[PDB]
Amino acid sequence: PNYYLYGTVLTRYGLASLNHDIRRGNKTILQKGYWNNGKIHSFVGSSAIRWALRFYLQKQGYLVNRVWDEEEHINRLTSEDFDPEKFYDDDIFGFALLPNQRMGALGMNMAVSLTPYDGAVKLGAKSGREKDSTSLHFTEYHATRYQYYFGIDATHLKDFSRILPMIDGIMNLPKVGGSSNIFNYPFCPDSLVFQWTNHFASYISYCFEYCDPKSKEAKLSQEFIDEVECGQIDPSKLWIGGTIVKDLQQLDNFESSPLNKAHIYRNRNEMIEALKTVIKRDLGL
Amino acid sequence: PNYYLYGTVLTRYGLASLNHDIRRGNKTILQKGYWNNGKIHSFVGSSAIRWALRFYLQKQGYLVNRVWDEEEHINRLTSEDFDPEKFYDDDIFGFALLPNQRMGALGMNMAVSLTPYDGAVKLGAKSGREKDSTSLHFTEYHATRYQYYFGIDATHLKDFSRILPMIDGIMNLPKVGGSSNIFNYPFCPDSLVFQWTNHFASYISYCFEYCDPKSKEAKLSQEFIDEVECGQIDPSKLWIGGTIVKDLQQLDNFESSPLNKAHIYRNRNEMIEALKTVIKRDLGL
Amino acid sequence: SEEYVDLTFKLRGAPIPLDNGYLTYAALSRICPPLHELKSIGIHPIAGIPTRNNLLELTAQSRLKIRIYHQQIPLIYPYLAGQAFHIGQNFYQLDIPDYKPLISSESVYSRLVIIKGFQDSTNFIEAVQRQMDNLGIQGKIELLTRQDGTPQRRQLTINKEGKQFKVRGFGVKISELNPEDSLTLQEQGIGGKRKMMCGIFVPATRSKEEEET
Amino acid sequence: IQGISELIALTPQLGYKPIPIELTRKLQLILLVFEQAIGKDVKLLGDLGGIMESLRIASTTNQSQPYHLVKLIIPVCEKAKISVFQLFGSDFKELGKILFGNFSLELKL
Amino acid sequence: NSEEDKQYLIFIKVFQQAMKGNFAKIYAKTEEGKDPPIKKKVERLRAELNYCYDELSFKEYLSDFLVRGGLNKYFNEHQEEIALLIKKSPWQEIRIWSLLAIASYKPKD
Amino acid sequence: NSEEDKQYLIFIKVFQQAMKGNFAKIYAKTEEGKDPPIKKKVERLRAELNYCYDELSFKEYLSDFLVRGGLNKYFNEHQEEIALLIKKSPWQEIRIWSLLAIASYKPKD
């Protein structure tokens, strides 16, 4: 059975200076674009999150082709030929030599800031050899929560058991970017929306949305609630949890709403354990 | 009697880099061109959607002449000589040898981006140091919801029963060819306008329209509503389902409008079931 | 968590007394006027290897760490980035600052807390509990003890004008906070003399560091 | 004359001995505001090129070196549409906000 | 003749002079027998010119390039014409002119 | 005679020298005993030249290819003439001239 695991995970509020752009003349501009309602939002490249997941995989055993030196900042290939059968990294993220050119199980989208990026430039003085000179430059920072979307083609994995470490890595994601992450911004999710279904159609891509930059409550989009209530997104296939569940449970008519029968847990680890039990049941692990 | 099912379908909002033209020197240029009101819109090739539907038919069992290896990234033919009678692929999509050459039951139009495409090119580095020719690479992306219209000649089908799996695939459309590793764009529909009639005259072409540039409203064109109201496009033959249903129901005097007499379902699966029941009635299945 | 930042400066120079609160505060205010009027600012104790004469020898890990709201950094960064100050006749230099987050931990600790008019340990525990409730915080209060087990008091010498005043305080360890309340504690703190280099709270390992020696 | 009068009248009101790098970094902030304004509007380069070069030189030479009052600071704050009183009196936040508003930038320090 | 082509040619000259200033700057930066990176600098300039996403992008870039070039005598004599030409005309056309200018600098030296 | 034809001939030479520069670049890039792709590169150039959809397209490509060529003396000698020829003239005739240059560089080697 072709099984897929899609999900939109949301991070905690904080300052972000993660994926700076070409840095036009002095400001390390934050990667921004257009989003809902035509207001500028800051983004985080999905490749950075994929690199963070790969680093997590390399940290805790999990034989991986690309080893991060952490000192010389050079990736070294354990084997020249890519072997997804043996390596977690090649099996999950794929590869391209330019051999086999693996398609890669995990798919990702860039993280979109919940609130629009308005201002918030910061003063950064870089040193200089010119008789101990300090030239002032600018650096953009954003105080928001990043949500991103990802999909796992569980059937595509060479070893079906390799899905389990991936969810752990998402839960225990390391520092994203590293040196340029000026303010240490955690990417461990604080609220999850997981759909473990068996058909290609996938909603809940960007269900999280609050807007109203004055606060950081990180509500749920009315579109997702409506889609759940209508009959689509089978509640037995829906896994929801985090601080958003605390807000959801307080809502009126929650017991009567079809959102109730969806798998819901206040604690995220309870989600992870129950969902992993479900996966091991469905994949014969 | 000849029967035709025409449909304008709108995808979900998100970040997409599905189609790329020529790769100038470092950017994978999103397939773009002029459209309504003379501003550049990004495009998604109809051939990519046809490939996605064929891959869907391959995945969920069924018989297909072209088999997608998913490991060698090569296409294999079950039989060198095509046979529309047996295989779903050759019957639905047609084939050219250069025999029979068929005509193809499914005819699709290229997918236009609801939102005008301005900028938003992605950066792309790599670990650090020892930088080679593949170290720096840009990538274009568009934050929009793609929309494409299609039409199928049911009578042209060698087996009339094959229409149902096609609609099922259009619902649960797999990944559409694009950089899904860093831009996972779900192509599952969120709004449908279907017309099941016995005439060649195919209205209800691109009708979904954007209320605000750089936004995700997706209201319905005034010309299409005026066409429905004026008398043409018989509401009894009109099949509307998706998120646009809520916007339609919030329109004033909707009950008095002829649109209310059309088959509308806020849930997509309910409308799909009703349409398939009607089709099975009209084809004697 | 990330809504508050701890500004860290690689500090080098002469060895410093271990009760150097007012000295470093006055030097910083001398080289940074806006520091003298801010409210939610506090300074972390300066680490190092102490000496026999109640002085601390600055090491590579010795650094000046300042707790500040992220919406007030541009008022302090110009006057400290690369800047140098004098404590008495000693020269001290600060490098380009780096930002460190406010991480939650299961248990916290403070080296020196002072609340006016509380010298005995029991009433000090009661007052720290009162400030503890005022912040909507839950936990248990313990006082760091010497090798003798006696609660350890630390003294701050404010050399205002010709005279100098004595203020005595205790080391307070609070555990079982829950991470949200833990963050609230580290950011608020207890004692108020955070400009006076006392009230900042730290994870509990530094409590063991101070209890060993 | 007004700039020099503001300079004389402001010194007793500071309440402290001015810090050289405070003034140097205020000048650098004005330079960054000028650069952002030029980035937004190309025409302003014609009006501000000489002062841009002068400020860049003053920020590349030793910071402890004094700056020529009438030759450099007064024209610089003049083109920035800022009084000498505002330049030497307001903190970095107020100075940055007023500069951004003056050149209609979207920055927020 | 054909005044708009005059503006185009003076824009070519302005860009060439600005890149002359940038080349002089980077020659000044390097020292000792290492070959100063110029062909690499030309490649970087081309790549940064190619990278743009309309209007603000590549316009802030052209303004910053003209600023880092230094003092442009042709720009000094032709402030209004150059500014008006930059503000108007499709940005792709200005990028094409800039690329021409790129390959047009060599007769200077 | 017929100075337009002179400009056309010098443009042919300019394009030839640019392709010479790109040939030198690809020859520098290749390593080991691998055959340097020249026929493949020429066919790729011709295919990209045929692929074009008016004005911005193929003119951006012409400018980018000339920049990739690097130092070109024939373009150095005559600035205004070639600049005006590139900015003016229908792009299809420029394509004709460039393709003729493709076939007329082979005299050089």
Coordinates of C-alpha atoms in Angstrom, one line a residue, chain B residues 102-282:
Chain B
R102 CA -5.0 7.0 -32.0
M103 CA -6.3 10.5 -31.1
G104 CA -6.3 10.4 -27.3
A105 CA -9.4 10.7 -25.2
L106 CA -8.0 13.3 -22.7
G107 CA -7.3 16.8 -24.0
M108 CA -5.7 19.3 -21.6
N109 CA -4.6 22.9 -21.6
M110 CA -1.5 24.4 -20.1
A111 CA -1.8 25.5 -16.5
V112 CA -1.6 29.3 -15.9
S113 CA -0.6 30.9 -12.6
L114 CA -3.6 32.6 -11.0
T115 CA -1.2 35.3 -9.7
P116 CA 1.1 37.4 -11.9
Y117 CA 4.7 36.4 -11.5
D118 CA 7.1 39.2 -10.6
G119 CA 10.3 37.9 -8.9
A120 CA 11.2 35.5 -6.1
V121 CA 14.4 33.7 -7.2
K122 CA 15.8 31.3 -4.6
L123 CA 19.5 31.1 -3.5
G124 CA 21.5 27.9 -3.4
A125 CA 24.9 27.3 -1.8
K126 CA 26.6 24.2 -0.5
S127 CA 28.3 23.4 2.9
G128 CA 31.5 25.4 2.7
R129 CA 34.8 25.7 1.0
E130 CA 36.2 23.6 -1.9
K131 CA 33.6 25.3 -4.1
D132 CA 33.4 24.0 -7.6
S133 CA 31.3 24.8 -10.7
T134 CA 28.2 23.4 -8.9
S135 CA 28.6 25.5 -5.8
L136 CA 26.3 28.4 -6.7
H137 CA 22.9 28.0 -8.2
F138 CA 19.7 30.1 -8.3
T139 CA 16.1 28.9 -8.6
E140 CA 12.9 30.7 -9.4
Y141 CA 9.7 30.2 -7.5
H142 CA 6.2 31.6 -7.6
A143 CA 3.7 31.9 -4.7
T144 CA 0.4 31.3 -6.5
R145 CA -2.3 28.7 -7.2
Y146 CA -2.1 27.2 -10.7
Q147 CA -5.2 26.6 -12.8
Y148 CA -5.7 24.5 -15.9
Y149 CA -8.7 23.6 -18.0
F150 CA -9.3 20.1 -19.6
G151 CA -11.8 18.2 -21.6
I152 CA -12.3 14.5 -22.4
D153 CA -14.2 12.7 -25.2
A154 CA -15.8 9.9 -23.3
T155 CA -17.2 8.3 -26.5
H156 CA -13.7 8.1 -27.9
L157 CA -12.7 5.8 -25.0
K158 CA -12.2 2.2 -26.1
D159 CA -13.7 1.2 -22.7
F160 CA -16.3 3.6 -21.3
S161 CA -15.6 2.5 -17.8
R162 CA -12.1 4.0 -17.8
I163 CA -13.5 7.5 -17.2
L164 CA -13.8 6.9 -13.5
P165 CA -10.1 6.2 -12.7
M166 CA -9.2 9.3 -14.7
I167 CA -11.5 11.5 -12.5
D168 CA -10.1 9.7 -9.4
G169 CA -6.6 10.6 -10.5
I170 CA -7.6 14.2 -11.2
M171 CA -8.7 14.3 -7.6
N172 CA -5.6 12.5 -6.1
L173 CA -3.1 13.8 -8.6
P174 CA 0.5 12.7 -7.7
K175 CA 3.5 15.0 -7.8
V176 CA 3.7 17.2 -10.9
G177 CA 7.2 17.2 -12.4
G178 CA 9.2 19.8 -10.7
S179 CA 11.8 20.5 -8.0
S180 CA 9.9 18.6 -5.3
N181 CA 13.0 18.2 -3.1
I182 CA 13.0 21.9 -2.2
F183 CA 9.6 23.0 -3.6
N184 CA 6.9 20.4 -2.7
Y185 CA 3.8 21.7 -4.4
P186 CA 0.6 19.7 -3.9
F187 CA -1.4 19.7 -7.1
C188 CA -4.5 18.3 -5.6
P189 CA -7.6 20.4 -6.6
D190 CA -9.3 22.7 -4.1
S191 CA -12.0 24.0 -6.5
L192 CA -13.7 22.4 -9.5
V193 CA -16.0 23.5 -12.2
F194 CA -17.1 20.5 -14.3
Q195 CA -19.6 20.3 -17.2
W196 CA -21.0 16.9 -18.3
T197 CA -22.9 17.6 -21.5
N198 CA -23.3 16.2 -25.0
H199 CA -22.2 19.3 -27.0
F200 CA -18.9 20.2 -28.5
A201 CA -19.3 23.8 -27.4
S202 CA -17.0 24.1 -24.4
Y203 CA -17.5 27.1 -22.2
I204 CA -16.3 27.2 -18.5
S205 CA -12.7 27.7 -19.7
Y206 CA -10.3 29.5 -17.3
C207 CA -12.8 31.2 -15.0
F208 CA -11.2 31.3 -11.6
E209 CA -9.9 34.8 -11.1
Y210 CA -7.8 36.6 -8.6
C211 CA -9.4 39.3 -6.6
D212 CA -6.2 40.9 -5.5
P213 CA -2.8 40.5 -7.2
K214 CA -0.3 38.9 -4.9
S215 CA -3.0 37.2 -2.9
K216 CA -5.0 34.0 -2.6
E217 CA -8.6 34.9 -3.1
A218 CA -9.5 33.0 -6.2
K219 CA -13.0 34.4 -6.8
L220 CA -15.0 33.4 -9.9
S221 CA -14.7 35.5 -13.1
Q222 CA -17.6 37.9 -13.8
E223 CA -17.8 36.8 -17.4
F224 CA -18.4 33.1 -16.4
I225 CA -21.1 34.1 -13.9
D226 CA -22.8 36.3 -16.5
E227 CA -22.6 33.5 -19.0
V228 CA -24.3 31.1 -16.5
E229 CA -27.0 33.7 -15.7
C230 CA -27.7 34.8 -19.3
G231 CA -29.1 31.3 -20.1
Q232 CA -26.2 29.4 -21.7
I233 CA -24.2 26.8 -19.7
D234 CA -27.2 24.9 -18.4
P235 CA -27.0 24.7 -14.6
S236 CA -28.3 21.1 -14.6
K237 CA -25.1 20.2 -16.5
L238 CA -22.9 22.3 -14.2
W239 CA -20.8 20.6 -11.5
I240 CA -19.1 22.9 -9.0
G241 CA -17.1 21.7 -6.0
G242 CA -14.4 23.1 -3.8
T243 CA -13.4 26.1 -1.7
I244 CA -15.1 28.4 -4.2
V245 CA -18.5 27.0 -2.9
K246 CA -18.3 29.1 0.3
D247 CA -17.6 32.3 -1.7
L248 CA -20.4 31.5 -4.0
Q249 CA -22.8 30.9 -1.1
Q250 CA -21.8 34.2 0.5
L251 CA -22.7 36.0 -2.7
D252 CA -25.9 38.1 -2.4
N253 CA -29.2 36.9 -4.0
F254 CA -27.4 33.6 -4.8
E255 CA -30.7 31.7 -4.4
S256 CA -32.4 33.8 -7.1
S257 CA -29.4 33.4 -9.4
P258 CA -29.4 30.4 -11.9
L259 CA -26.1 29.4 -10.3
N260 CA -28.0 28.0 -7.3
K261 CA -29.7 25.5 -9.6
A262 CA -26.3 24.1 -10.6
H263 CA -24.9 21.0 -8.8
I264 CA -22.8 22.6 -6.1
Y265 CA -21.1 20.7 -3.2
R266 CA -18.8 22.2 -0.7
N267 CA -17.2 18.8 -0.2
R268 CA -15.2 17.6 -3.2
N269 CA -15.7 13.9 -2.7
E270 CA -19.5 14.2 -2.5
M271 CA -19.6 16.1 -5.8
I272 CA -17.2 13.5 -7.3
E273 CA -19.5 10.7 -6.2
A274 CA -22.6 12.4 -7.6
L275 CA -20.8 13.1 -10.9
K276 CA -19.6 9.5 -11.2
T277 CA -23.2 8.2 -10.5
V278 CA -24.5 10.5 -13.2
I279 CA -21.8 9.4 -15.6
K280 CA -22.5 5.7 -14.9
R281 CA -26.2 6.3 -15.6
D282 CA -25.5 8.1 -18.9

